[PDB]
Amino acid sequence: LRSTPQDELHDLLCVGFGPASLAIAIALHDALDPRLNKQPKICFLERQKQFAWHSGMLVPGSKMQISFIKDLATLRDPRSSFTFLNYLHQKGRLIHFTNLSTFLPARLEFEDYMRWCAQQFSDVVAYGEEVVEVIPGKSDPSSSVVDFFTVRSRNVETGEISARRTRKVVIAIGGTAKMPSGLPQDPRIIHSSKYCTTLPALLKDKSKPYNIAVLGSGQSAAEIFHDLQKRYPNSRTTLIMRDSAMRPSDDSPFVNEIFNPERVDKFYSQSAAERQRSLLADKATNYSVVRLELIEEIYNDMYLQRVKNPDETQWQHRILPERKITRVEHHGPQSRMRIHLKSSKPKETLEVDALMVATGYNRNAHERLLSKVQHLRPTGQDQWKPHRDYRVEMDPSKVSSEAGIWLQGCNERTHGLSDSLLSVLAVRGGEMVQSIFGEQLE
Amino acid sequence: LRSTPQDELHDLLCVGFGPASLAIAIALHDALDPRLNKQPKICFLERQKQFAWHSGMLVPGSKMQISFIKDLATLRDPRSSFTFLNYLHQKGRLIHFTNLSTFLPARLEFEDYMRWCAQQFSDVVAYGEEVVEVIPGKSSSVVDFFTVRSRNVETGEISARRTRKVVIAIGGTAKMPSGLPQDPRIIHSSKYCTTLPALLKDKSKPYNIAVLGSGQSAAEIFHDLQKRYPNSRTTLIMRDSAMRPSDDSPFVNEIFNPERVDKFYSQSAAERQRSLLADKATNYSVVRLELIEEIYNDMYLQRVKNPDETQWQHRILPERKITRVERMRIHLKSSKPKETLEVDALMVATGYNRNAHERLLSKVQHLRPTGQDQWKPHRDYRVEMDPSKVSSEAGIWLQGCNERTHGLSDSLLSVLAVRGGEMVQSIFGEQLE
Amino acid sequence: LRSTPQDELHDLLCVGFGPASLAIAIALHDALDPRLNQPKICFLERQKQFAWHSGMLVPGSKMQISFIKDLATLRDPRSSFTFLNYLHQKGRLIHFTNLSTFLPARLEFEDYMRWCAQQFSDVVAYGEEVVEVIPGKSDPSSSVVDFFTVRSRNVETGEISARRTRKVVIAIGGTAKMPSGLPQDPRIIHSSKYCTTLPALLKDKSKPYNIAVLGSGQSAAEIFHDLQKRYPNSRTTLIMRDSAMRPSDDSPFVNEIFNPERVDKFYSQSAAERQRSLLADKATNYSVVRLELIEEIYNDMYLQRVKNPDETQWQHRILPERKITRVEHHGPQSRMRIHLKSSKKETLEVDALMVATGYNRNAHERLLSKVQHLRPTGQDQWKPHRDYRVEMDPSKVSSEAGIWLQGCNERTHGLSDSLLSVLAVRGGEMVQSIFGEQLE
Amino acid sequence: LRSTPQDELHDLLCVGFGPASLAIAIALHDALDPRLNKQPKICFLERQKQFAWHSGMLVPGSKMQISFIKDLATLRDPRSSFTFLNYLHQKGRLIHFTNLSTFLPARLEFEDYMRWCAQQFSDVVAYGEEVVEVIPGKSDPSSSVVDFFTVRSRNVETGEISARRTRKVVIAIGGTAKMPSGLPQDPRIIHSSKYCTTLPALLKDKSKPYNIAVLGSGQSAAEIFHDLQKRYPNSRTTLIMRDSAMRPSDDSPFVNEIFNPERVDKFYSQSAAERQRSLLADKATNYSVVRLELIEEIYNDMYLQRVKNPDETQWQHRILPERKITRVEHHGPQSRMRIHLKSSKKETLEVDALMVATGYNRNAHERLLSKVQHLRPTGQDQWKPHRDYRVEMDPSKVSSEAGIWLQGCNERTHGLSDSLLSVLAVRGGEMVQSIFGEQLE
Numbered sequence A: 001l002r003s004t005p006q007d008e009l010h011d012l013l014c015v016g017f018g019p020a021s022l023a024i025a026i027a028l029h030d031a032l033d034p035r036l037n038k039q040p041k042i043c044f045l046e047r048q049k050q051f052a053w054h055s056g057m058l059v060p061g062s063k064m065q066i067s068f069i070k071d072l073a074t075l076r077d078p079r080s081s082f083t084f085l086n087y088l089h090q091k092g093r094l095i096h097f098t099n100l101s102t103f104l105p106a107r108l109e110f111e112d113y114m115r116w117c118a119q120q121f122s123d124v125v126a127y128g129e130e131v132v133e134v135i136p137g138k139s140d141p142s143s144s145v146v147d148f149f150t151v152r153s154r155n156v157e158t159g160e161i162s163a164r165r166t167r168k169v170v171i172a173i174g175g176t177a178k179m180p181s182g183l184p185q186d187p188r189i190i191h192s193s194k195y196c197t198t199l200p201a202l203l204k205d206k207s208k209p210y211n212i213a214v215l216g217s218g219q220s221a222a223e224i225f226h227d228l229q230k231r232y233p234n235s236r237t238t239l240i241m242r243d244s245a246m247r248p249s250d251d252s253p254f255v256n257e258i259f260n261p262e263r264v265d266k267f268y269s270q271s272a273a274e275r276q277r278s279l280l281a282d283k284a285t286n287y288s289v290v291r292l293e294l295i296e297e298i299y300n301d302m303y304l305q306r307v308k309n310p311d312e313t314q315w316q317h318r319i320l321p322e323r324k325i326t327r328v329e330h331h332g333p334q335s336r337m338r339i340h341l342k343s344s345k346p347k348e349t350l351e352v353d354a355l356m357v358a359t360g361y362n363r364n365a366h367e368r369l370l371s372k373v374q375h376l377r378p379t380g381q382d383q384w385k386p387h388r389d390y391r392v393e394m395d396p397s398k399v400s401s402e403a404g405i406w407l408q409g410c411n412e413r414t415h416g417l418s419d420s421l422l423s424v425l426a427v428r429g430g431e432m433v434q435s436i437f438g439e440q441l442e
Numbered sequence B: 001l002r003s004t005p006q007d008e009l010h011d012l013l014c015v016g017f018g019p020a021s022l023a024i025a026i027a028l029h030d031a032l033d034p035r036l037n038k039q040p041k042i043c044f045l046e047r048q049k050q051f052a053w054h055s056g057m058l059v060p061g062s063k064m065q066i067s068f069i070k071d072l073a074t075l076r077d078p079r080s081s082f083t084f085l086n087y088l089h090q091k092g093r094l095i096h097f098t099n100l101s102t103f104l105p106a107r108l109e110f111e112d113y114m115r116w117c118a119q120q121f122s123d124v125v126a127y128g129e130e131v132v133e134v135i136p137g138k139s140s141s142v143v144d145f146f147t148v149r150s151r152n153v154e155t156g157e158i159s160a161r162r163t164r165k166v167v168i169a170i171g172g173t174a175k176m177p178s179g180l181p182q183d184p185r186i187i188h189s190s191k192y193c194t195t196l197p198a199l200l201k202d203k204s205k206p207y208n209i210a211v212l213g214s215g216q217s218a219a220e221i222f223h224d225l226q227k228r229y230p231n232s233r234t235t236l237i238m239r240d241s242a243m244r245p246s247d248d249s250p251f252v253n254e255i256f257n258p259e260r261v262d263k264f265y266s267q268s269a270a271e272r273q274r275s276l277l278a279d280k281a282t283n284y285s286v287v288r289l290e291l292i293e294e295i296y297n298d299m300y301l302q303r304v305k306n307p308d309e310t311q312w313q314h315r316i317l318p319e320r321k322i323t324r325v326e327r328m329r330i331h332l333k334s335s336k337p338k339e340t341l342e343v344d345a346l347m348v349a350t351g352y353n354r355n356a357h358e359r360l361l362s363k364v365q366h367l368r369p370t371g372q373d374q375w376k377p378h379r380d381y382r383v384e385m386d387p388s389k390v391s392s393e394a395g396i397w398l399q400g401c402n403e404r405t406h407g408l409s410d411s412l413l414s415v416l417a418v419r420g421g422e423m424v425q426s427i428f429g430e431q432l433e
Numbered sequence C: 001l002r003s004t005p006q007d008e009l010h011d012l013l014c015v016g017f018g019p020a021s022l023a024i025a026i027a028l029h030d031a032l033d034p035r036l037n038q039p040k041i042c043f044l045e046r047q048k049q050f051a052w053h054s055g056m057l058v059p060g061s062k063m064q065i066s067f068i069k070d071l072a073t074l075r076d077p078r079s080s081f082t083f084l085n086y087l088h089q090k091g092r093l094i095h096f097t098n099l100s101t102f103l104p105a106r107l108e109f110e111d112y113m114r115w116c117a118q119q120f121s122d123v124v125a126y127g128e129e130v131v132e133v134i135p136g137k138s139d140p141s142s143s144v145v146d147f148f149t150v151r152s153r154n155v156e157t158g159e160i161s162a163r164r165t166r167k168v169v170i171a172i173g174g175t176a177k178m179p180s181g182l183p184q185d186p187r188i189i190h191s192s193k194y195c196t197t198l199p200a201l202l203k204d205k206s207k208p209y210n211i212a213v214l215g216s217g218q219s220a221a222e223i224f225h226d227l228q229k230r231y232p233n234s235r236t237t238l239i240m241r242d243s244a245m246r247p248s249d250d251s252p253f254v255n256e257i258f259n260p261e262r263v264d265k266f267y268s269q270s271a272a273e274r275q276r277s278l279l280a281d282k283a284t285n286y287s288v289v290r291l292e293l294i295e296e297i298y299n300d301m302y303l304q305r306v307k308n309p310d311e312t313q314w315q316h317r318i319l320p321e322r323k324i325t326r327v328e329h330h331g332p333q334s335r336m337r338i339h340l341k342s343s344k345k346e347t348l349e350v351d352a353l354m355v356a357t358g359y360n361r362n363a364h365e366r367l368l369s370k371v372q373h374l375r376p377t378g379q380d381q382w383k384p385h386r387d388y389r390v391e392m393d394p395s396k397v398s399s400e401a402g403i404w405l406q407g408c409n410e411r412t413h414g415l416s417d418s419l420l421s422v423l424a425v426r427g428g429e430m431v432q433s434i435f436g437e438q439l440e
Numbered sequence D: 001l002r003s004t005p006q007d008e009l010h011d012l013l014c015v016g017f018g019p020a021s022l023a024i025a026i027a028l029h030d031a032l033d034p035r036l037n038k039q040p041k042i043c044f045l046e047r048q049k050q051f052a053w054h055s056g057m058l059v060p061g062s063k064m065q066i067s068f069i070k071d072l073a074t075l076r077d078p079r080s081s082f083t084f085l086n087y088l089h090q091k092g093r094l095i096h097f098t099n100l101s102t103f104l105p106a107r108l109e110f111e112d113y114m115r116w117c118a119q120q121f122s123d124v125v126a127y128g129e130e131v132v133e134v135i136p137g138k139s140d141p142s143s144s145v146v147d148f149f150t151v152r153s154r155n156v157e158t159g160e161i162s163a164r165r166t167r168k169v170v171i172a173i174g175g176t177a178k179m180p181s182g183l184p185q186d187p188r189i190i191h192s193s194k195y196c197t198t199l200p201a202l203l204k205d206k207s208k209p210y211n212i213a214v215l216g217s218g219q220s221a222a223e224i225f226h227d228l229q230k231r232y233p234n235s236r237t238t239l240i241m242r243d244s245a246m247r248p249s250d251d252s253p254f255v256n257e258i259f260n261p262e263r264v265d266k267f268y269s270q271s272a273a274e275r276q277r278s279l280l281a282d283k284a285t286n287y288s289v290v291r292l293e294l295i296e297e298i299y300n301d302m303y304l305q306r307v308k309n310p311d312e313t314q315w316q317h318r319i320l321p322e323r324k325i326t327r328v329e330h331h332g333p334q335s336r337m338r339i340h341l342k343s344s345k346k347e348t349l350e351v352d353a354l355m356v357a358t359g360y361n362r363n364a365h366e367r368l369l370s371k372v373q374h375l376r377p378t379g380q381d382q383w384k385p386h387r388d389y390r391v392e393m394d395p396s397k398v399s400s401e402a403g404i405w406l407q408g409c410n411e412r413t414h415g416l417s418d419s420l421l422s423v424l425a426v427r428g429g430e431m432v433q434s435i436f437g438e439q440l441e
């Protein structure tokens, strides 16, 4: 994809360059390849200084939780140059991965696969750009009708505010860390999204006997609890969960069909109540769950401590189920905080050097980013309403049919449990290219 | 165990000789064995003509869903002669089972294990006897024994036995949808292997057979039908969108540990009810993952041959409910808050109710304390009796129907070895000291 | 690929259209595709349509090789002839993803190869059984051989036809191997003819036939296991010389001998090291069974032990360390009498004996008999170079003419030679060696 | 079992208190329990200061490679108190092990079970006792036939020599470390049997970037190669194997029937040629093989290194196949040795240690029995045990009330299960009937 001058009127601007935007960029490339099919002025803005995929949780040994066939191209076109298999071949690694007999690459490897993808679009991506607002624009003096948008971004290095004009906008900014409201702010209280990048700076000495607590019972909580035991081999770690136990993620094959690309149509057209009941019944596919293999390795590690000492209170690493944090003392010059625990049903204290908080994410950042254009929604809406093709509803007497804003990655409530994942990314990128660029390339 | 003359006043009579009563019999044997602990008058009444474990569902290839370590003795005393490993050694099969490298024996094999246990108690078990009522007795207004009346299934004659203590261990009764009519071609899962072959005699005919439900039994029946009638057209009808996997992940699975019954029983009703609901995936409306996948590959091969799933020989109809049954004509609607199948048979795999003891005890429920509409079992499974109406040497115990008070392990094999031990100490404890 | 008129001088004629030749046609197609980067080519195939070992497409049989080792992906994952691309064209890619397996059903993997093969219909002549490769000399003044005449028998009409080509590839797989001393009888059927021939012999699926199976490898286990479902009342007997079925090896360090990049290193080794290396890796391919199938068969036997502790009474039995000493097959009797002795006093009466004893890969020697005098003086076997071209006497054969062997070269090229393992990459090298300079 | 006074004439003296002898003592207990069936003078001598099972190879995370049902009692009688399942019950862990859902306990745990068994026989076991010779004895001067043996043991603490008299002797001494001949003696060259016990004493600082080499391709080499990478996370380890690859151990179910106890009869009665051919064809069940799960993990580790750098030669931890050591230079002050390698059809490594995982020889019984070697029948140069493991003696030189039995060193005559735990439970039973059968009847 060729770059467009920054001051020119773009056909599309995407906010964020994570996998969701990357799959749009790939799909456009493939849609423009005569070899694969029957140029738009595009750019991408990403706040990070270079492409990176959840680097705070690139835990040593952590694995993907989705078949590599669900990559950024293969489900739309296995012939694409951006398949995961073509990447291995380009690296001289395909025969070697074949002998792994796994559908589950290491997270480190799949991120390098996406880095290999992203770097081929570097001419159309501006890194170190934090988008802060979308502002309406009207190109014609005669009309009060909005027919473009001005996107404003702050450069993370200079702080300078730059402005770009585009006819259409995509918001693909993933999630922001979700914290329990009652925890106080403190350098020693670190969300899972920043585990690998900040906790080593906080606890520099790998051999010191730190007390480190982990809050949560889902995949990130189990991976952090397990990694800590290897990363700090002399530590005393504690897993604090509201649930009675870690529970297994569900990717049994019939259940897993809710993630098929062709289900988005059927999910979207069902009623709101039916959608919420469906999301709840399938909660075990994605939320507050741990891969069984990790459950079993952690259970075996607990069992070995039981062999060595039958008294669980003396174990080096413990799990405290059905617990909730009632108070955290974080004042004073001392190394450690005092966490107060009660049962999580409708006394005990831990002194810890750090509390890792694995409570997931919110996906509501588009509301702050779009506030200066929310007066363009149809009358009476307090939320953005994406259509099946992901374009939000605008008042048609206020917005031209040539302008629009699309949302990506935050539509689980309307489009299904695959919306925030990689599951439908290859196909969605294709649908998006037809939606945003169809008539232009036709 | 030696027999007691039928006309004598027993120390204990157990109603039903399924695994729960068998473990009680085994625990008593071990309690009386000097090798294991350095005789009470007992007897068992069983409706079936001989020992059998869910004979309607011994489908070919069906496996146990619980480790063989959870047999009728091992968790209580690994040295017992009634362990599953001791049974295999007695059969000359222990080295061969070792090499299977499985904790989950065939259900056919596990039934044989318990049959082998049961035959060692043949002298105290009366088979072909349907208990029909438990009546109070007064040896005064204080009740100090119970008269248990049973109908012989062969003669129909009503026999009567007197006992100081009674155990009700009668498992469950088939739970049916209220809207199904009575017809020989509508069969609960409990009678699948024993009744459907007599109905569908010719294995090669193109029968249409429907299977109702989405749990382990529905999947086993659905899958077995395709092998048993290879030209049939089968349909699995589920209210749910998919079969879901059973959970025995190791931390979740500790709720079935024997020492958790103490903590579970002492929790409040609300905590017990919420605990049961969150752990529902361990036992209800769930299928062993291996079977889900096996069935999925079978669907996949049909997809290879025909991309149109509506033309497939064997189908799954998710999110459906039966609205009427009129070959029978099944009418289906969506199960969310006009389809028809014509079927030669309807298999109904909807589980069980365990409330059959209430009718069996109806004539003694006036001995409960004032204001009770249900039997209230204590931790040791003894039901509360009015202390001014029933002597303390008399009482009634419930087994297998106490999930609400004692946890999800109550109707399963999980805690039987240990529970038998508690039951023998509960019921015969002071007698043996 | 466009067809070449039959009477014209071809650049390449391949004998056989199985997977080995199929990887060649796909490779040449891709070499000519501008997205990824015409010779006069034709393929002759004895079968009337494309088919891959149809006698052993037993129900539930699975591949023993990763779908990644299909006919294109290791050479170019972008090719249109990949297995993942096949699934996508059939609208089945998402459903296969949820299978979570690298091992498709053999029935499915054959449909993928048929789907590929159908795109070359214009350059494949089916129903043509090649019978000889004859020398040709274009110049009456020269004694030099510079083209070859391939004669093929029409399987329907019996008519013989001749096609001329400068270069020949022999890609004809293997021939059924039978133990000498078994006699010929319609009730004695090699594994290669199981699905196509046994139903014609034993028509009644419910009759209590006695059926014996000879061998201890993958096909023997699959036939033994399939018979029990196909004839549910039968008595089956698996007769093995070995003491037990042994598991096939695709553990990851060992499995690298099948890497495409091992063909160079293996080939450059001496005969002794090559003969020794093949021997040490026998468990990857010969007289071995998929562990999962071993475990299933074992579970079936254990259940019979639950039902009856006397092994002699079992419906289905395995007889280890046995050899067949004699077969009585004349007489009006439906059944044969197989006489057994230990292989270090048994008779079986059987309605059929299935023989799962593998293949020989020497059939090209008869097909090349009329050109073997072009070999260098003193050779008794065709000597394939690294690029699979056989050594010819350079004073007898022009440098523009040659013959290549495919699939029969394990002795020089390693255990992957007769499998699907290196076909994608080998198809590509073959196109470079045969057509490289032409496409310059 | 009740102890017998040291100076008295014993019925049985066992050299060694490892698993083979432990199953015999357990079997004798169970034979004497009226609870299990319808006391002989016994004592056990063990060189180690207390019971231990290959503690040099109790690698963290190491698993058993045999189902727990093949413990020290269960195949002979599941009702014994010495079963693995009963041990868990005594330790209050049975339900917790059940939820593990594995037939393969940790090596750490299974050793603890045998320690739990062994401690119940502490009264008949003399630890720290190295038996050095067995000496013929004649109770009647005028008769020329031997009817007892004197077993002499050296105390590892004091050096004091102790002699004990017995009518029957069992030799159950496991193996001695087998080293390749061309390797020299050096403290930085340590056999695998001494890994956990010696290597940390050599390489004290776990964080320095040591070069450590491992020689071999079987289970022990892979276990040590994998463990070094976690134990010394900054080290560079090298696995050197003569074979081209690590190969999976075979315990598939039909092949695995060779370890069934009832097969010992059929195997023993085969001719030497058939037995030698049988051992070779089933070699992948026990020799130069690694548990598949470990192979796959080591392979995943190599693959991740390939992800980080495609050039193998720059990798931290490497595997060098089809290699042989042609020379080791180890003289001088330089901390590292120089290993010289050639293909096994000029490469050199500087190493701080060479771990040698080359298995064992089981011929130590010949030196120990040298002073009784003249009692064998004429023309034998090796001890030949009968099916019941009793060695052949000249019947004119030794009374029938006396004899010597071998345990664990009889693979050649009794099958691949002989050196393992596979038949210990049943064999212990046969041994008590052979040695004490008439005595208890």
Ligand SMILES: Cc1cc2c(cc1C)N(C[C@H](O)[C@H](O)[C@H](O)COP(=O)(O)OP(=O)(O)OC[C@H]1O[C@@H](n3cnc4c(N)ncnc43)[C@H](O)[C@@H]1O)c1[nH]c(=O)[nH]c(=O)c1N2
Pocket (backbone or CB within 6 Å): A015, A016, A017, A018, A019, A020, A021, A045, A046, A047, A048, A052, A054, A057, A063, A064, A065, A066, A129, A130, A131, A132, A172, A173, A174, A175, A220, A408, A409, A420, A421, A422, A423
């Ligand atoms: C540790 C961990 C592990 C997994 C997963 C999450 C996490 C945290 N996921 C789910 C995950 O959401 C998914 O893998 C993708 O990251 C979805 O990509 P998105 O593009 O929607 O956003 P994502 O968070 O990937 O990327 C969003 C981008 O937007 C940028 N951005 C934010 N604000 C901006 C602004 N104001 N201006 C410009 N740019 C901005 C961010 O920097 C980021 O680069 C997953 N899914 C799956 O299918 N399989 C799996 O195995 C996993 N595993």
Ligand SMILES: Cc1cc2c(cc1C)N(C[C@H](O)[C@H](O)[C@H](O)COP(=O)(O)OP(=O)(O)OC[C@H]1O[C@@H](n3cnc4c(N)ncnc43)[C@H](O)[C@@H]1O)c1[nH]c(=O)[nH]c(=O)c1N2
Pocket (backbone or CB within 6 Å): B015, B016, B017, B018, B019, B020, B021, B045, B046, B047, B048, B052, B054, B057, B063, B064, B065, B066, B129, B130, B131, B132, B169, B170, B171, B172, B217, B399, B400, B411, B412, B413, B414
């Ligand atoms: C098909 C199937 C498969 C499984 C299971 C159930 C079913 C239906 N279960 C759970 C099952 O309930 C449990 O294994 C035991 O059978 C419970 O034993 P009870 O004897 O308490 O009931 P159960 O039904 O076993 O026994 C009750 C007995 O009383 C008799 N009876 C009833 N009424 C009577 C009367 N009025 N008079 C005299 N006798 C009477 C009955 O005939 C029966 O023999 C299971 N659990 C587990 O832990 N692991 C597993 O894998 C499975 N698998």
Ligand SMILES: Cc1cc2c(cc1C)N(C[C@H](O)[C@H](O)[C@H](O)COP(=O)(O)OP(=O)(O)OC[C@H]1O[C@@H](n3cnc4c(N)ncnc43)[C@H](O)[C@@H]1O)c1[nH]c(=O)[nH]c(=O)c1N2
Pocket (backbone or CB within 6 Å): C015, C016, C017, C018, C019, C020, C021, C044, C045, C046, C047, C051, C052, C053, C056, C062, C063, C064, C065, C128, C129, C130, C131, C171, C172, C173, C174, C219, C406, C407, C418, C419, C420, C421
């Ligand atoms: C039951 C079974 C199962 C498997 C396998 C074989 C068998 C029999 N194979 C091994 C097999 O060799 C391989 O898969 C490929 O078929 C190799 O194909 P070839 O083209 O080399 O010849 P192959 O035998 O496939 O086909 C050669 C073709 O040549 C044609 N032909 C022969 N002689 C002729 C003549 N005289 N005139 C004209 N045409 C002629 C034949 O008709 C045939 O179609 C396998 N491999 C693998 O990599 N993974 C696996 O899981 C398996 N599984």
Ligand SMILES: Cc1cc2c(cc1C)N(C[C@H](O)[C@H](O)[C@H](O)COP(=O)(O)OP(=O)(O)OC[C@H]1O[C@@H](n3cnc4c(N)ncnc43)[C@H](O)[C@@H]1O)c1[nH]c(=O)[nH]c(=O)c1N2
Pocket (backbone or CB within 6 Å): D015, D016, D017, D018, D019, D020, D021, D045, D046, D047, D048, D052, D053, D054, D057, D063, D064, D065, D066, D129, D130, D131, D132, D172, D173, D174, D175, D220, D407, D408, D419, D420, D421, D422
């Ligand atoms: C690291 C490792 C791991 C395993 C195994 C071996 C090794 C090295 N084995 C095989 C192993 O040989 C077997 O488990 C038992 O050790 C066999 O016991 P032995 O009694 O033959 O003695 P073993 O070799 O156990 O012990 C012999 C004893 O004799 C003593 N002794 C020696 N000489 C003496 C003397 N001169 N005087 C006094 N005492 C003396 C020694 O001190 C020692 O205690 C195994 N098997 C299996 O079935 N499953 C498995 O998973 C494994 N795993």
Ligand SMILES: NCCC[C@H](N)C(=O)O
Pocket (backbone or CB within 6 Å): A065, A066, A067, A070, A250, A251, A256, A259, A285, A286, A421, A423
């Ligand atoms: N959390 C990851 C879920 C991935 C999903 N099961 C899929 O197969 O697409």
Ligand SMILES: NCCC[C@H](N)C(=O)O
Pocket (backbone or CB within 6 Å): C064, C065, C066, C069, C249, C250, C255, C258, C284, C285, C419, C421
């Ligand atoms: N017969 C199967 C050979 C496949 C080979 N192990 C491979 O991985 O290429």
Ligand SMILES: NCCC[C@H](N)C(=O)O
Pocket (backbone or CB within 6 Å): D065, D066, D067, D070, D250, D251, D256, D259, D285, D286, D420, D421, D422
């Ligand atoms: N090397 C350990 C051998 C274990 C053996 N396969 C058995 O089943 O006894």
